[PDB]
Amino acid sequence: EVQLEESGGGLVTPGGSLRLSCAASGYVFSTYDMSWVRQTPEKRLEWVAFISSGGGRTSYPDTVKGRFTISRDDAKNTLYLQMSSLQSEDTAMYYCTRHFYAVLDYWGRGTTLTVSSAKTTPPSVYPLAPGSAAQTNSMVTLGCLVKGYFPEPVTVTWNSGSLSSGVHTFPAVLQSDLYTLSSSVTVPSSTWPSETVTCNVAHPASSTKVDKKIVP
């Protein structure tokens, strides 16, 4: 089976350089033309580079011409994307794809690139309580607001994993160079506030953990 595996991304700072790799296997790599394409956090796809069989023709959109260089090493079945003068607009998941007779058929799993000046920062955790007592019914929904961290990810659990049904942990948003996200859990009204509910937030990059108790 055809397999494409990209690697080399991570966290870099604006103005920096990096080289991604796309390792191919299961077909004769040298016969086909290839492209790198990226997917932005807004979820748009952008083509970013192309190289032909033989490596004699390469082409790029104007947004990266002069900064990115695509190349290929047929002896190793690997496609490279050399990136310099990185800017935060390069933050995206990068994917290599092969041109199989004008069909972009196989795509690798992708590798994450985050271009940011932010420093590593633990989140502050705020409790989301219903407050207004004119509830809805017999289930109550609580939450945790996890604000200002960098970089991703964060993991959230409720009562150290004891509470797992009805939890919703939302994708993050980027506000002012830092991420924010929320998580909520719906529990039977006989439970809270008689019993304690806590959100346990772990931020691996800062090696930080915050346990926040939700009180009416």
Binding site: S35, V37, Q39, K43, R44, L45, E46, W47, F50, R57, S59, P61, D62, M93, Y95, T97, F100, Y101, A102, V103, L104, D105, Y106, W107, R109, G110, S124, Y126, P127, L128, A129, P130, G131, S132, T141, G143, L145, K147, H168, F170, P171, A172, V173, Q175, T180, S182, S184
Partner: protein
């Protein structure tokens, strides 16, 4: 260069036939644009369906086909199935450059339409000490996966300070989304009514707080 546009979202029933279109700002798609159609399935999993306008890749089920219609490239799914609920991107070749459209979110109803359950939360006392107030509106359990959220403060439409996440798929295959209203703690104190309104399938569910 060219601006490629596609329908944003489409809904169909399984066993039905749907067509997705792809247009260029440049004028008219032709055969020399070698239109491709790529599918995006949950967990950033991409598969090339069609290339050179109407050549299907190997392994792609026969219900996918491509063509040029009225100056546009088109994808037809004859007999849409439940596993066809995905994002379909279009890409047009222009002299050595690929130009991709924004993607069409296709829904193939595999379950009954389900209304969002909405919850609006007041800013917490701890955040008020930092002089900032975040209102959070959580929206879960909706299907199909497309909603519209509008905020109001004292009956006036809000035009800035709000951020809503893109619908994300839940474990029961319904979707969920979140919306945030970011005020200063002064502002929060100076207004008295706050509303989060969610529009799903022509119905508006509104949660409010004074």
């Amino acid at each position: 260069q060219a601006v490629v546009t596609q329908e944003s979202a489409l809904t169909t029933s399984p066993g039905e036939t749907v067509t997705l279109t792809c247009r260029s700002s440049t004028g008219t798609v032709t055969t020399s644009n070698y239109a491709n159609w790529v599918q995006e399935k949950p967990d950033h999993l991409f598969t090339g369906l069609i290339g050179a306008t109407n050549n299907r890749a190997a392994g792609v089920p026969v219900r996918f086909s491509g063509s040029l219609i009225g100056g546009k490239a088109a994808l037809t799914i004859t007999g849409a199935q439940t596993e066809d609920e995905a994002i379909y991107f279009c890409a047009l070749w222009y002299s050595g450059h690929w130009v991709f459209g924004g993607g069409t979110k296709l829904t193939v109803l595999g379950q009954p339409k389900s209304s969002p359950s909405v919850t609006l939360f007041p800013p917490s006392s701890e955040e008020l000490e930092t002089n900032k107030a975040t209102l959070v509106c959580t929206i879960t359990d909706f299907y199909p996966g497309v909603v519209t959220v509008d905020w109001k403060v004292d009956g006036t439409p809000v035009t800035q300070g709000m951020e809503t996440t893109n619908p994300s798929k839940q474990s029961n295959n319904k979707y969920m989304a979140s919306s945030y209203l970011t005020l200063t703690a002064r502002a929060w104190e100076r207004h008295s009514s706050y509303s989060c309104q969610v529009t799903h399938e022509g119905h508006t569910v509104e949660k409010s707080l004074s």
